[PDB]
Amino acid sequence: SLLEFGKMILEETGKLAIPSYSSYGCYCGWGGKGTPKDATDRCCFVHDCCYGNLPDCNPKSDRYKYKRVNGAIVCEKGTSCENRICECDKAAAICFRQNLNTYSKKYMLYPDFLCKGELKC
Numbered sequence: 001s002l003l004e005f006g007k008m009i010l011e012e013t014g015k016l017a018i019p020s021y022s023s024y025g026c027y028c029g030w031g032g033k034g035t036p037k038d039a040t041d042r043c044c045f046v047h048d049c050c051y052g053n054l055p056d057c058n059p060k061s062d063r064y065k066y067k068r069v070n071g072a073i074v075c076e077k078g079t080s081c082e083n084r085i086c087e088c089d090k091a092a093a094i095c096f097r098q099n100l101n102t103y104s105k106k107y108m109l110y111p112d113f114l115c116k117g118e119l120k121c
């Protein structure tokens with residue numbers, strides 16, 4: 001769920017999910033279209049695609065458990081939707097950490113009309 005996702009992001013980046021990653025680019029947070037603006041926005045796009053592979057799960061409200069083993073994120077065993085949701089989020093958080101150096105404030109609150117395009121998962 002969002003709860004877990006938000007806390008993973010903070011632990012990983014030292015940034016709060018809202019609002020550093022909830023209105024960024026074309027996909028972070030409220031996506032649907034266009035070309036992702038940078039590496040961080042691409043993390044969000046792949047994250048959307050990851051969720052997109054679980055039609056019958058509810059990644060926003062279904063809660064899972066994970067633990068840190070030294071720095072590593074380890075998803076604990078829950079239902080099959082939970083395991084798979086956690087793997088999607090874990091990847092997004094690492095992707096965020098990896099591109100933290102190009103994170104740009106120019107992309108916060110990015111306007112909808114500039115998200116245009118077509119990009120298939």
Ligand SMILES: CC(C)Cc1ccc([C@H](C)C(=O)O)cc1
Binds near residue numbers: 002
């Ligand atoms: C963090 C808080 C603002 C929740 C939030 C943000 C964006 C979305 C979109 C609709 C999505 O997840 O597809 C859902 C929930």
